[PDB]
Amino acid sequence: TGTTIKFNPPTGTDTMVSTNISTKHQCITAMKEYESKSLEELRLEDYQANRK
C-alpha cells in the first residue's frame, strides 16, 4: 500500500528497426510489486498516508 518500496526500473530486451537492443523501463508499475495497481492508485494511497 503506497510507494514504500524504492523505484527500480526493470530491465528487458527488444529489437529495433534491424538490430538487438537492451531496455530499461521507467515506470514504477512495471515492477513486480506494483503490477497489480495503477499510477493513480499508488499516488492516491501515498496522499492519504501523508507520504508526499
Binding site: 503506497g2 510507494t3 524504492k6 523505484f7 526500473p9 530491465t11 528487458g12 527488444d14 529495433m16 537492443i21 537492451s22 531496455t23 530499461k24 523501463h25 521507467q26 515506470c27 514504477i28 508499475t29 512495471a30 503490477e35 497489480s36 495503477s38 499510477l39 493513480e40 492508485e41 499508488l42 499516488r43 492516491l44 501515498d46 496522499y47 507520504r51 508526499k52
Partner: protein, 331 residues
C-alpha cells in the same frame, strides 16, 4: 509555447475544451489539489480565469454537456458533480463506492445521461436529476480509462480488460476484446471513418506502445497494428508510459503525450510519425483539442511514474496551448 494564466497548484490529470455550441473557446482542468478550474481563451492566446470549484478528493476526469451549459467532474471522493456555469452552482449527481476515474456525456437520439467509471468495478448512468442511477453495468475490474462517441463506447480496465459497448436505445456490452498490448492499460481514444461514424479506437499502455484497433476490419491481421512511441533513444532505451491520446477532430490524425515529457503527432492511415517535441522538465500528464482542432492543450505535471521519491511539490505545473492544426495535416 504559451503558458496558461493562474495554473493549479498541483499535478493536472485531465483537460477538456468547450463544445461548438458555445461561442469562443473555454478550457477545463482538474488537478490533484481537488480543484476544477475554467479559463476563457482569447483568439490571441490570452487566458482569463473565469470560475473554480472544489472536491474533497483529486479530480480525475472532466467533460462538458452537449449544449454547453454544464461541466461534469470525477473525483477520488467516490462522487461526481454537475456544475451549472451561468449560476456557478455545483451539486452532486453521482455516487460510487470507490474513486471515480472516468466521466462522459452521452447524447443519444432517445436518451441523455452521464457515465461514470470507477475503481469499484462498476459503470453507472445518471440523469443529473435523480439520486438513483438509471442503469448500472458491471466491469470485471477497476476502470482505468474510457471514451464515448455515439453509438460506440470503449472502456479499458485493470488486468488488461477491454470492452466495447453499444449505445442505441440503451447501453449494453457489444464485445470483449483480447487486448493487443501486454502491459498496463492507461489511455484510450476513439476515431471515426470517412462517413463520420465510429469505427475503432487507439489503446495506450505504460510500455511506450500504442495499438490501433478497428471494430470490423476486412483483414484484422494486417489492418490492426501496434507501434512504439515515447522512448528516449548501443545503449539501453528508456521506456516511458503513454499518459494520454487524442485525435484531431478535422484531420483524423492523433496526438500522444507520455512520461518522457514529450508529445508526438501521428498518422495511423499512412503509419508515420509527424512530429516530436522537446523534452519538458517534467512529464506531460494530459492533453485534448478544441472543437475545431485549432488549439492543442497539454499539461506538464508529475505523474507518479517513478514514485513518491521523485515528487517535487515546488516545480511549477504548466498548461500549454499550441495553435498548430497544420502540423497534423496529412500529405
Amino acid at each position: 509555447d504559451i503558458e496558461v494564466t493562474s495554473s493549479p497548484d498541483d499535478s493536472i490529470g485531465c483537460l477538456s475544451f468547450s463544445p461548438p455550441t458555445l461561442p469562443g473557446n473555454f478550457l477545463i482542468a482538474g488537478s490533484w489539489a481537488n480543484d476544477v478550474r475554467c479559463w476563457e481563451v482569447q483568439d490571441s492566446g490570452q487566458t482569463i480565469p473565469k470560475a473554480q470549484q472544489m472536491h474533497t478528493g483529486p479530480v480525475l476526469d472532466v467533460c462538458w454537456s452537449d449544449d454547453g451549459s454544464k461541466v461534469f467532474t470525477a473525483s477520488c471522493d467516490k462522487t461526481a458533480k454537475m456544475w451549472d456555469l451561468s449560476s456557478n452552482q455545483a451539486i452532486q449527481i453521482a455516487q460510487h463506492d470507490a474513486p471515480v476515474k472516468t466521466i462522459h456525456w452521452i447524447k443519444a437520439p432517445n436518451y441523455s445521461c452521464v457515465m461514470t467509471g470507477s475503481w469499484d468495478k462498476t459503470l453507472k448512468f445518471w440523469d443529473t436529476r435523480s439520486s438513483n442511477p438509471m442503469m448500472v453495468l458491471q466491469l470485471p475490474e477497476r476502470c482505468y480509462c474510457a471514451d464515448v462517441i455515439y453509438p460506440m463506447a470503449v472502456v479499458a480496465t485493470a488486468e488488461r480488460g477491454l470492452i466495447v459497448y453499444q449505445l442505441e436505445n440503451q447501453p449494453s456490452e457489444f464485445r470483449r476484446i483480447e487486448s493487443p498490448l501486454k502491459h498496463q492499460h492507461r489511455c484510450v481514444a476513439i476515431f471515426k471513418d470517412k462517413q463520420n461514424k465510429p469505427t475503432g479506437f487507439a489503446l495506450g499502455s505504460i510500455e511506450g506502445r500504442v495499438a490501433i484497433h478497428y471494430i470490423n476490419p476486412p483483414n484484422p491481421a494486417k489492418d490492426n497494428f501496434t507501434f512504439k512511441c515515447h522512448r528516449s533513444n548501443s545503449a539501453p532505451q528508456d521506456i516511458y508510459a503513454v499518459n494520454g491520446i487524442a485525435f484531431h477532430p478535422v484531420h483524423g490524425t492523433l496526438a500522444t503525450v507520455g512520461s518522457d515529457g514529450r508529445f508526438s503527432f501521428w498518422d495511423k492511415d499512412a503509419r508515420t510519425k509527424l512530429k516530436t517535441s522537446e523534452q519538458l522538465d517534467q512529464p506531460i500528464s494530459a492533453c485534448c483539442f478544441n472543437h475545431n482542432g485549432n488549439i492543442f492543450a497539454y499539461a506538464s505535471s508529475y505523474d507518479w511514474s517513478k514514485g513518491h521519491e521523485f515528487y517535487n511539490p515546488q516545480k511549477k505545473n504548466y498548461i500549454f496551448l499550441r495553435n498548430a492544426a497544420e502540423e497534423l495535416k496529412p500529405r
